[PDB]
Amino acid sequence: PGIVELPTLEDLKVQEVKVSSSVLKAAAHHYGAQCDKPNKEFMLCRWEEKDPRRCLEEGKLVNQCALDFFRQIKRHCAEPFTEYWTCIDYSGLQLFRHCRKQQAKFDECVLDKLGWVRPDLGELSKVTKVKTDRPLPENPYHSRARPEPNPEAEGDLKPAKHGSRLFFWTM
Amino acid sequence: DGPEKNYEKTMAILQIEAEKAELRLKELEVRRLMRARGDGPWYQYPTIDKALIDHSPKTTPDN
Numbered sequence: 001p002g003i004v005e006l007p008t009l010e011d012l013k014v015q016e017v018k019v020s021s022s023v024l025k026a027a028a029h030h031y032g033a034q035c036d037k038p039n040k041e042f043m044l045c046r047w048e049e050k051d052p053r054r055c056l057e058e059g060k061l062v063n064q065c066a067l068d069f070f071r072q073i074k075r076h077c078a079e080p081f082t083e084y085w086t087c088i089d090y091s092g093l094q095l096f097r098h099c100r101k102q103q104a105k106f107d108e109c110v111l112d113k114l115g116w117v118r119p120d121l122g123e124l125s126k127v128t129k130v131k132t133d134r135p136l137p138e139n140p141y142h143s144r145a146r147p148e149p150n151p152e153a154e155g156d157l158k159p160a161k162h163g164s165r166l167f168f169w170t171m
Numbered sequence: 172d173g174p175e176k177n178y179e180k181t182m183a184i185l186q187i188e189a190e191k192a193e194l195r196l197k198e199l200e201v202r203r204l205m206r207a208r209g210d211g212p213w214y215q216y217p218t219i220d221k222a223l224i225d226h227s228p229k230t231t232p233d234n
Contacts, residue, residue, distance in 0.1 A: 046232035150210045162191050 006053055014060045015067055025094055026085035029119040030110060031069055038065040040130035050140040077109030 017024075024031075032039070042058035049055055073081055084102040091098050110116045163171045205211035 043232070047228055050233050052233065150212075150215070153212045161194060162187060165191055165194060 007056055011056055011060075014063045017063060017066050017070065019070070020089075022089035022094060023081075023085040026081065026088050026106070027069075027073070029124065030116045031066070032124050033119045034116050035062070035065045035069050036128070038062045040128055041132045044130050044132060045134070048134075048136055048140060050137075072114065073110075076113045077106070080105040080109050 038058070038061045042055060042062050045055035045058050046052070052059075080102070084099065084106045087099045087102050088094055088096070096103060107118050163169065201211075202214075205214050209215070
């Protein structure tokens with residue numbers, strides 16, 4: 001049925017984040033509220049294009065933008081960050097309700113050195129009007145042409161010519 | 172009554188019979204052809220409506 005052409009191995013070398021889950025989830029909200037610009041249009045690319053291959057250009061940017069956020073903490077209160085994310089992992093659910101004191105310590109540090117405020121409840125869960133440059137695909141499913149529907153029935157009803165016309169029956 | 176009564180009456184019957192005969196043969200041609208190519212008002216066997224289908228975004232990007 002054809003060619004399954006896919007991107008080469010050349011473009012699949014991004015500076016992959018080397019962190020673990022706990023440190024990923026320890027920041028989470030601040031990372032989500034400070035790196036939304038590359039997240040939104042890339043995810044919008046994932047939905048609109050309906051194909052992973054066409055969103056490689058945005059796929060690397062979100063990973064790259066993560067590093068700029070991540071190393072920004074290293075030049076700042078990363079020691080409170082280490083104490084935080086090294087206390088989250090100890091819980092099996094990776095739950096924040098048991099690490100509230102370090103939640104404050106990370107928040108109070110990031111509040112003034114950088115200014116990333118704590119996202120209020122429900123703020124992340126919000127549809128956003130992400131600006132984009134790419135035009136919308138003409139057919140995201142690459143749908144082919146459509147069969148022409150059968151001609152529509154019309155015309156005023158007329159009495160059945162010569163009645164029932166079934167064997168000898170008339171009228 | 173006069174023979175002209177039966178003459179005209181039979182002719183009207185013959186015309187009615189011929190049109191009835193001609194229409195019957197055409198119906199056997201219409202119904203069979205419609206059952207073959209399908210592009211007709213009847214014999215349209217039911218399908219699934221294109222309205223009952225969710226087009227809102229899913230939970231998985233590709234679809």
